[PDB]
Design a protein around this ligand. Structure first.
Ligand SMILES: Cc1ccc(S(=O)(=O)NC(=O)Nc2ccc(S(N)(=O)=O)nc2)cc1
Ligand SMILES: [Zn+2]
Length: 257
């Protein structure tokens, strides 16, 4: 019964998930002047050409577009990563207003939303094992700002009416996640966690510098989703973001000067 409300929100999570106050929690503020360029960081390799999307699910906190991760079909490699990480799902976090919604912040700036492409390290065999490892996951984070529409997002937006409430899913095949990527793959990277319960400290975060633009109409449709199940009182799925957590003993590295 954790959530994003007054009585079950991020400030309450530590009672069920003590790791909420751990040493490598996410998200964080990215202080751009303190992040250090790391010349040894390899270029990021995003290989989504063979992606097989399957389904879209409202899980009561966000919506997940799920992929077939039983073969190396859509993988993330390079950058700070050792080995091959398979795409399992993507989802977003967003606000009730355009001035908030992202989890990561940049010099304390909040974006309207944040896209998370979640990948797991193939050396651990499946997602459940990977989340128990400090290098188990790689999440590619992409900021959304409100401006021009993102054409590649529209197919997602248009199916949302069919998964309005918690527990609803719909077929979502042949979706190409390359249409959600910005031009540049310049990034910041640091060791962190899942940003929702169970908050496991198993994530290498790769957060892209360049946001994508989405239209006001696109984000408004995100905000029509429901946290609640069908036949329960309507509570709009908005402000499903965790705020910035203490950086503690971590350095954020940049791939770019
Ligand atoms: C092993 C296992 C653990 C947790 C789940 S889950 O579906 O209940 N939770 C989960 O997937 N959490 C999660 C949390 C945060 C993020 S995030 N927001 O950091 O990208 N992605 C996924 C499933 C299998
Ligand atoms: Zn997320």
């Amino acid at each position: 019964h954790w959530g994003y409300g007054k009585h079950n929100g991020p400030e309450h999570w530590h009672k069920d998930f003590p790791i909420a106050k751990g040493e490598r929690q996410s998200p964080v503020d990215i202080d751009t002047h303190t992040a250090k360029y790391d010349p040894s960081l390899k270029p990021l390799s995003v290989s989504y050409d063979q992606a097989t999307s399957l389904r879209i699910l409202n899980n009561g906190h966000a919506f997940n577009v799920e992929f077939d991760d039983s073969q190396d079909k859509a993988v993330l490699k390079g950058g700070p990563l050792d080995g091959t990480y398979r795409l399992i799902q993507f989802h977003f976090h967003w606000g009730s207003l355009d001035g908030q919604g992202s989890e990561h912040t940049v010099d304390k700036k909040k974006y309207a939303a944040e896209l998370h492409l979640v990948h797991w390290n193939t050396k651990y065999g499946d997602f459940g094992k990977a989340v128990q490892q400090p290098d188990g996951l790689a999440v590619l984070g992409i900021f959304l700002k409100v401006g021009s529409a993102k054409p590649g997002l529209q197919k997602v937006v248009d199916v949302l009416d069919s998964i309005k409430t918690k527990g609803k899913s719909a077929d979502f095949t042949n979706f190409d996640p390359r249409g959600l990527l910005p031009e540049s793959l310049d990034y910041w990277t640091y060791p962190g966690s899942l940003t929702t319960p169970p908050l496991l400290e198993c994530v290498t975060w790769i957060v892209l510098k360049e946001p994508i633009s989405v239209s006001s109409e696109q984000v408004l449709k995100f905000r029509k989703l429901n946290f609640n199940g069908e036949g329960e009182p309507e509570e709009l799925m908005v402000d499903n973001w965790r705020p910035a957590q203490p950086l503690k003993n971590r350095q954020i590295k940049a791939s770019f000067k």
